[PDB]
Design a protein around this ligand. Structure first.
Ligand SMILES: Nc1ncnc2c1ncn2[C@@H]1O[C@H](COP(=O)(O)OP(=O)(O)O)[C@@H](O)[C@H]1O
Ligand SMILES: Nc1ncnc2c1ncn2[C@@H]1O[C@H](COP(=O)(O)OP(=O)(O)O)[C@@H](O)[C@H]1O
Ligand SMILES: Nc1ncnc2c1ncn2[C@@H]1O[C@H](COP(=O)(O)OP(=O)(O)O)[C@@H](O)[C@H]1O
Lengths: 35, 370, 370, 370
């Protein structure tokens, strides 16, 4: 990456991706009766 | 040629579509219409402004989705064709209208202008040669195997308790008061308004319907469970936040049996069905008292049918055989029932052929749909 | 025109310049507007009397250096004209406005008047046939390849997160803010007076800016690191004059998150980003949590984005996975993304035909710059 | 105990005060909640350093103004606490809640915790003998003398039509909408930054709202007048700064009927009024066509009612006589109708004793409001 080395607005020691962490019923026949 | 027919279940909240012979309509998504909200300037976005399925579910709050079938009243005809086209697309059908027969569905009391309008679609825009359209209650009867049953569907805004006898729904006894959970969820949004939350966007309201289908049930005791203090179960927001539930999960569906909460001169599904019972043969009622045919997507609650049983107990007299016949694959039960009906061979007559439609159109349908 | 399209790197503090297809902006330089502070009575001195380039980037105190972009909003116009004449200088271009397609970039919600001035320039003084004026965060999306993302710019007096999603026009959701390190460095001149350093020149301010860009950072612990005492490392002037750095290196940039140190009520733009989050939707919020871009020169500080990570961790709820993306070439990301867009065939429709556009007034591309 | 009844206008936009029988609200002031922006060192500043009243009404840019009434719904009860302490100020009333019958008002559909919390204050800190939190459109019914009628209200971030008939339980037909001039003036600040007018403070917002109330009309034709050539009325600030306007003065109130300008999905309160008409019945609809009331202080505009009447005509049915009665002092009229009701002694049933509130509270609220 020469283009990423040439200009001065290209800092180093950059873990660019700054992030956070990551720590991790249908029924049938419900009948009745009345008799 | 009469190829594999396509059973298309036009459920109020969720439309279903799939070839007959199958047991699952492989091509399903709810009954909606999704247009965007913003204007994509940069590329990397989809085009068409009518995004359905994974696009819709993907770009929920990005699309200002709407709903065509409003209690069985659909008005997005052109976009409906595009919805069918979306199914006709390589995504779902990959075939043509002319190539495969179509088994479309219906509801009672529908305006023949809209029905024949759909025939104009599948015979002019689309060119289905073998198209037959009918009720969804009979489809549920094919699923249950029962012939003398009172079918009541439960969609999002459609509830028609239709009493059928041997495959002959008595029109004098047919009850169609198509209104369901749509306004119940809207009234739950009113609860949220009385909690400080708005869900004016459809997708914003889709989450409400998701929790509605998820965190709700039927407390059999109406005012007893209503007057008792709820626990207000904190349910997770989709972003990662969390909000209470309250009585709403059972208080809002009380409106189904008590339509006066929304201020509507109705009587509650159970009483309407009893009215349907009254308009029949007394001896057949005892069968129908035990021929409780449940159907629709909104029949998925705890104590749902049991609270309904309590309603029947408050309605039906003693020594009355009551028997709930709940299905499990409710909306697809009708879809598979259509897969059964479309598999029939005598079935070739009453479907309006393309030439039959060319003959009269309107009256050819009128006489073939009746 | 069938030539290389010019990509104006209209940076707030550092306004670079370049073309399309290239990966390096041709010339990089700030908003310095110098004119000598003396009179060359002796013949044999240097000409110009207006200095852009090494003439000013080599001699500073001799020249009355100026800066008209009042938080990006330029007030000089004649000087800008001369700057653009210098854009066509011998070392710089030796080309014509007519000879090249030119692409301009802008911050959102800028006054139309500025674009009118630009039209006057590139349509009366200059005569660019293919001249388009655009945004700046879209460019960063081109460079990153992303379409969905929270683009935080970092100018000298302009910083604001741009929450984008596939180029969708979300001006209400997207937030613009014009404040950055300019007055932070000036506030450090206040520190200088509170530490005995008599400096009042913009050149002196540039030396302080060399410290700003060099010996400054963001301590993730605000008062835990502020209430302590550093050894005040020593900085050396152009002469090499020893001057202690002090806690200021991290104390002064806290104003970016604590705007009330200057007294101006604001939030610390990460909270404005949270406001944009509020304007967005729950799961789409999660996408933008995972999609955050950091461009602009002022992003370059130790623990910068990490401190902001901690900020949002103190702001965003639980189980909220957020992801940032800070390309090494922050300012160049906009420049290279402009090279990307300028290298497009669709981009030909973005601008309007030069002469007719002049006859079209300015409202046409004002409506087409979205 | 029947002393003079306190008339508490719960003005979200502008709060008003006094007792019954007073034909003019004695104390009238907005939602402003201040305390100094700066920090006084030498004595000379006033005492309390959280100022609301004349001190705030004379020191705008000095006090950090805030607002708890998010859409007329106070979140910082502490603000109201101090407000109510100020209610008995030496300038104001110097009396006790214990010493007076008190009456409260309320825009419907607010979350129960709001009026419950308020009543907690007035029956715990303050100790009212008998009170009630009435509605707000009944005040207007007294001001008009009518019983049947659509009452539009206007706070600061709340505006909605209230269809009434003799005080009858029609909450479904009755509507509530929380949107008004707050964000309209914030959108005016957006216009300011749109054309370089650097304005961001709350006191600055007060100034903006004063000119908004001053220099903002309503052109009857929306786009026919919006696409004209504006004169850009140079408003000379109270300081003396000349500031143009553009079509923005009438563009911003269009948002109240064009919610898509801010991106909100709504209809226009007149369309919601038409929905209320639909929710009513044909016989009662005609009454509402004849009975329309515009109220609330935010309704004050130039070309206001004529434009809205025309828009209604654009959406009205076939030649139905649209009639809008109007109070000249929409701010006063409300408080005065409340003064009428407070002076109405049939309130004996309508009040809530302190003891009753201690026993039930929420149940007493509902059972006494229904
Ligand atoms: N678990 C559930 N709870 C409540 N309603 C449901 C559930 N599952 C599905 N539904 C309702 O059914 C609708 C889809 O059913 P639909 O196909 O419209 O049935 P029908 O054919 O009876 O109209 C959904 O929009 C939803 O409102
Ligand atoms: N290493 C660095 N550390 C901090 N700030 C820097 C660094 N390099 C450049 N900058 C900043 O970049 C800014 C220049 O503005 P610029 O980024 O060109 O405006 P824009 O963001 O509109 O392009 C100045 O604040 C300058 O301090
Ligand atoms: N000419 C005007 N234009 C717009 N708003 C106005 C005008 N005059 C007064 N106001 C508004 O008066 C409103 C006060 O509303 P008010 O009648 O007190 O309703 P509420 O009692 O619900 O607060 C404030 O929101 C302020 O914006």
């Amino acid at each position: 990456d020469p283009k990423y080395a040439d200009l001065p607005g290209i800092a180093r020691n950059e873990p660019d991706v700054y992030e956070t962490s990551d720590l991790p019923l249908t029924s049938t026949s419900v009948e009745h009766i009345i008799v | 040629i009469a190829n594999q027919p396509v059973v298309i279940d036009n459920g109020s909240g969720v439309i279903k579509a799939g070839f007959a012979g199958d047991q699952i309509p492989k091509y399903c998504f709810p009954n909606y219409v999704g247009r965007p909200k913003h204007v994509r300037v940069m590329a990397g976005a989809l085009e068409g402004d009518i995004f359905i399925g994974p696009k819709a579910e993907e770009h929920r709050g990005l699309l200002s989705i709407r709903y065509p079938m409003e209690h069985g009243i659909v008005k997005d005809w052109n976009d409906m064709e595009r919805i069918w086209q979306y199914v006709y697309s390589k995504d779902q059908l990959q075939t043509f209208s002319e190539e495969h027969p179509v088994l479309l569905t219906e509801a009672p009391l529908n305006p023949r202008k809209n029905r024949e309008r759909a025939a104009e679609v599948f015979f002019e825009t689309f060119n289905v040669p073998a198209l037959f359209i009918s009720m969804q209650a009979v489809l549920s009867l094919y699923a249950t195997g029962r012939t003398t049953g009172v079918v009541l569907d439960s969609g999002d805004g459609v509830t028609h308790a239709v009493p059928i006898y041997e495959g002959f729904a008595m029109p004098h006894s047919i009850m169609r008061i198509d209104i369901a959970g749509r306004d119940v969820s809207r009234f739950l949004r009113l609860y949220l308004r009385k909690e400080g939350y708005d869900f004016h966007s459809s997708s914003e309201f889709e989450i409400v319907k998701a929790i509605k289908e998820r965190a709700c049930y039927l407390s059999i005791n109406p005012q007893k469970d209503e007057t008792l203090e709820t626990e207000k179960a904190q349910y997770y927001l989709p972003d990662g936040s969390t909000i209470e539930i309250g009585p709403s999960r059972f208080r809002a569906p009380e409106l189904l049996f008590r339509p006066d909460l929304i201020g509507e001169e109705s009587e509650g599904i159970h009483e309407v069905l009893v009215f349907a019972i009254q308009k029949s043969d007394m001896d057949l009622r005892r069968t129908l008292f035990s021929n409780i045919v449940l159907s629709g997507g909104s029949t998925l609650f705890k104590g749902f049918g049991d609270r309904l049983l309590s309603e029947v107990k408050k309605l039906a007299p003693k020594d009355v055989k009551i028997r709930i016949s709940a299905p499990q694959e409710r909306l697809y039960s009708t879809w598979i029932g259509g897969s059964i009906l479309a598999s029939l061979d005598t079935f070739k007559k009453m479907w309006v052929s393309k030439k039959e439609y060319e003959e009269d159109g309107a009256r050819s349908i009128h006489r073939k749909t009746f």
